[PDB]
Design a protein around this ligand. Structure first.
Ligand SMILES: C[S@@+](CC[C@H](N)C(=O)[O-])C[C@H]1O[C@@H](n2cnc3c(N)ncnc32)[C@H](O)[C@@H]1O
Length: 249
């Protein structure tokens, strides 16, 4: 029945991350990414980190290499297998937990100095109730002085700049291009095209910057610093990403 379709959408994204990891090696990605995330955590004396969007494990492995104690959670068991084996290949024992954002402490019973939700993951929630619930679950998993690091694409530029926003964005040189095929206030569909000709189309929710900030404030975070993050190969006046640094207190 509809199990075939749900299996297809999971397999589609799994193929997407496999293609990304096939053509974009992690060392190139680590050097392109700053050490900004790591230093932010270090400056706050973070030891214990929960990654709630492990995916194939890049953020988790980077934090393990940096010396953090990391728990690697993801809603997808198949992602966590890839993440664990990638960490293994880099010489690290990952601690994987399958967990849905709407009930994060079902199987995670510890509290954390920081949570990372990176790679533009939070945009995958299309329901506002789910968005609030997810952020409340993260908030409850933080120690009193903990911090949430949560990023997203800059959807404001696409929703507002109009004709000047209808162009592709490139990552890791020219290895992948990302083109906004369709954007309205409720839905953004991007075309991802890789250097080998592979094409994937992915849906996400186009969170406005101040909306995300409003959600974070509303579930109880007391201080939110939003940083512009220029990750694309051909920089523009507007950053293509934002990084929210939300302090529980
Ligand atoms: C874009 S990937 C991020 C990968 C990694 N952070 C990186 O940048 O390399 C987003 C991940 O979040 C997970 N995810 C999406 N919705 C979720 C939910 N409701 N609960 C738990 N995980 C979810 C997906 O399984 C996927 O692995």
């Amino acid at each position: 029945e509809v199990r075939e379709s749900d299996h297809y959408e999971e397999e589609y994204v799994l193929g997407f991350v496999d293609k990304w990891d096939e053509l974009i090696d992690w060392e190139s990605r680590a050097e392109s990414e700053g050490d900004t995330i790591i230093n932010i955590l270090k400056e706050r004396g973070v030891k214990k980190v929960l990654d709630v969007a492990t995916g194939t494990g890049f953020n988790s492995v980077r934090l393990l290499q940096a010396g953090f104690d990391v728990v690697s959670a993801d809603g997808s068991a198949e992602m966590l297998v890839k993440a664990f084996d990638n960490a293994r290949d880099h010489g690290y024992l990952m601690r994987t937990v399958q967990a849905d954002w709407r009930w994060m402490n079902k199987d995670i019973h510890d509290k954390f100095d920081a949570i990372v939700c990176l790679g533009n993951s939070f945009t995958h929630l299309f329901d506002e109730g789910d968005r609030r619930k997810a952020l409340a679950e993260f908030y409850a998993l933080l120690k009193h002085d903990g911090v949430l690091l949560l990023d997203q694409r800059n959807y404001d530029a696409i929703l507002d700049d109009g004709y000047s926003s209808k162009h592709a964005h490139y990552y890791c040189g020219d290895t992948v291009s990302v083109y906004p095929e369709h954007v309205d206030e409720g839905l953004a569909r991007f075309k991802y095209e890789f250097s080998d000709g592979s094409v994937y189309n992915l849906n996400m929710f186009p969170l406005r910057k101040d909306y995300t900030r409003q959600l974070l404030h509303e579930v109880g975070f007391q201080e939110i610093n939003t940083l512009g993050d220029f990750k694309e190969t051909y920089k523009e006046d507007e950053p293509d990403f934002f990084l929210h640094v939300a302090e529980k207190n």
